[PDB]
Design a binder for this molecule. Structure first.
Ligand SMILES: Nc1ncnc2c1ncn2[C@@H]1O[C@H](CO)[C@@H](O)[C@H]1OP(=O)(O)S
Length: 208
C-alpha cells in the first residue's frame, strides 16, 4: 500500500474558522500598525494590505503537518508510517495549543506547541532546528506570498524561534487585542498571544 501525501492534525471546521479569522484579523491589524508601516522597506523592496499579500491560502480545512511523505517518495516516509503510535493515533482527536501568530516576507502562520503525547507523532529524521527542542517547527500555515514554496512556513518559524533563543525579540513595539506585538527585523513579526488558542483536530493522512 502507498502512503499519503502527508500525515498531520486536521482541525475541525469550527476551529479552522476560528483560527483563520484570528489570522485574518492579525494581518489587518498588523498592516494598519504604525510600527509595521514604517518598516515596509524591510518587508518588500518595491500601505500594504497583508491579506492580499499572502494571496495563496489554504482553500479549506487548516492543518498541522507532522511528516511529509509524498506517497512514499520522501526519505523516512515508510519508517514514519510504520510506527505503532502513528497507526494507533490514526483517526484520534487531539487539542493543539497555538502560542503565537507570525509573519515574514514569505509566509504567515500560527505556532503550535505540542505536548509530549503529540510529540510522539513528530518525525525524527535541518540546521535551523539546531538548538531548539524537537517539534519547534510545528505550525499551521495561514498564507504565503506568490512565489513561495511548501515547507517555507516551518523554516520561517524556526528562524524566528532562533532570534528569541538569543533574547533578541526586542521590546514589544505595540499591543494588540490578543497580545504583545514584536518586531524581529528583516520583515519578521510575532504576536505572542496572552491566552493560548486551543484547537480540536483529528490526526490522519491526506492523499491529495
Ligand atoms: N519537504 C516538504 N515538501 C512539501 N511539503 C512539505 C514538506 N515538509 C512539510 N510539508 C508540508 O506538507 C504539506 C503539503 O505540502 C504542507 O503543509 C507543507 O507544509 P507547510 O509548511 O505548511 S507549506
Amino acid at each position: 500500500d502507498f502512503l499519503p501525501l502527508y500525515f498531520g492534525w486536521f482541525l475541525t471546521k469550527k476551529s479552522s474558522e476560528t483560527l483563520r479569522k484570528a489570522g485574518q484579523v492579525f494581518l489587518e491589524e498588523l498592516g494598519n500598525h504604525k510600527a509595521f508601516k514604517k518598516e515596509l522597506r524591510h518587508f518588500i523592496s518595491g500601505k500594504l494590505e497583508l491579506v492580499s499579500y499572502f494571496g495563496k491560502r489554504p482553500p479549506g480545512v487548516l492543518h498541522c503537518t507532522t511528516k511529509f511523505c509524498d506517497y512514499g517518495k520522501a526519505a523516512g516516509a515508510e519508517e514514519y508510517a510504520q510506527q505503532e503510535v502513528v497507526k494507533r493515533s490514526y483517526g484520534k482527536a487531539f487539542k493543539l495549543s497555538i502560542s503565537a501568530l507570525f509573519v515574514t516576507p514569505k509566509t504567515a502562520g500560527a505556532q503550535v506547541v505540542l505536548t509530549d503525547q503529540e510529540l510522539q507523532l513528530w518525525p525524527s529524521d535541518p540546521s535551523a532546528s539546531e538548538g531548539l527542542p524537537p517539534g519547534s517547527r510545528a505550525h499551521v500555515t495561514l498564507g504565503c506570498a506568490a512565489d513561495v514554496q511548501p515547507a517555507q512556513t516551518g523554516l520561517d518559524l524556526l528562524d524566528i524561534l532562533q532570534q528569541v533563543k538569543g533574547g533578541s525579540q526586542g521590546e514589544a513595539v505595540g499591543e494588540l487585542p490578543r497580545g504583545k506585538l514584536y518586531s524581529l527585523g528583516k520583515g519578521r513579526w510575532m504576536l505572542s498571544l496572552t491566552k493560548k488558542m486551543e484547537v480540536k483536530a483529528i490526526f490522519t493522512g491526506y492523499y491529495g
